[PDB]
């Protein structure tokens, strides 16, 4: 299936409290594997996945230096955006970036992306074509023009089609035991009494990987999508995920409703009842 290498970057100014907080968290699919935190005791790029032990000391030195360099460019960016937006030096502001690439099952590039945001709102983003930029406002229009004269898009495209793709292939390889595994979910339903002869039925799915899963509650063959309560799939602390979906049904009518769990680790979908 497709695989992705994604980096979530954040720069937060802390007026009066010193230098801005700078962080980089990397992901291969749904697995955190590297991280840099400027507030760290000793700021260095560090492994977050066991399989990263295969990288030599030279890897960590290069990435750490890059991060420090990226930290500096973003300190300036924070100052700049204050000018663009005509804001005061005393406020805290944030810059967020999503950078990455995805490959098919055969390892070829499916797509690349890079998006920036200021204070929680879109700023500038590379277009699908990997050649043009799209600004969200006039301030971003200034950055767009600067980037066009500098040749940023050509430079970034080189990274997304080359480095990004090549290193993604390598990570998947060194960590295939982890990244290419499939933990099948384990499901179960719980019952909860409610006022007015009603009950809350909750269907749980635990310990699965990849994160992609489908939980549905049914009645008379039809899936009760509109009548479902549901949480976003969540990391459970050990590299696996969990999720639940609930439906409030009439007391004494519970047995009709069934829970269906769809996941790649289930050749045939799970079907449960309370």
């Amino acid at each position: 299936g497709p695989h992705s290498l994604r980096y979530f970057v954040t720069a937060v100014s802390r007026p009066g409290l010193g230098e801005p907080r700078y962080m980089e968290v990397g992901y291969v699919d749904d697995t955190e594997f590297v991280r840099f935190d400027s507030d760290a005791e000793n700021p260095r790029y560090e492994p977050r996945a066991r399989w990263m032990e295969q990288e030599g000391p030279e890897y960590w030195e290069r990435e750490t230096q890059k991060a420090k360099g990226n930290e500096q460019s973003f300190r300036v960016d924070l100052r700049t955006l204050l000018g663009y937006y005509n804001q005061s030096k005393g406020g805290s502001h944030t810059i967020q970036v999503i950078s990455g690439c995805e490959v098919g099952s055969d390892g070829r590039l499916l797509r690349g992306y890079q998006q920036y945001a200021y204070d929680g709102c879109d700023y500038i983003a590379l277009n699908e074509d990997l050649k043009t930029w799209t600004a969200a406002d006039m301030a971003a229009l200034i950055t767009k023009h600067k980037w066009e004269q500098a040749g940023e898009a050509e430079r970034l495209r080189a990274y997304l089609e080359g480095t990004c793709v090549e290193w993604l292939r390598r990570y998947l390889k060194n960590g295939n035991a982890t990244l290419l595994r499939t933990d099948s979910p384990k499901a179960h339903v719980t019952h909860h009494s409610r006022p007015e002869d009603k009950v809350t039925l909750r269907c749980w799915a635990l310990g699965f990987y990849p994160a992609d899963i489908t939980l549905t509650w049914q009645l008379n063959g039809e899936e009760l999508i509109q009548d479902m309560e549901l949480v976003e799939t969540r990391p459970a602390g050990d590299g696996t995920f969990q999720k639940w979906a609930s439906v409030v049904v009439p007391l004494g009518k519970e047995q009709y409703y069934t829970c269906h769990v769809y996941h790649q680790g289930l050749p045939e979908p799970l079907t449960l009842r309370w």
């Binding site: 990397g26 460019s73 980037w147």
Partner: peptide, 9 residues
């Protein structure tokens, strides 16, 4: 591997 030497904003 991360991107570097990016044009400032």
């Amino acid at each position: 591997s991360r991107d570097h030497s990016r044009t400032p904003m």
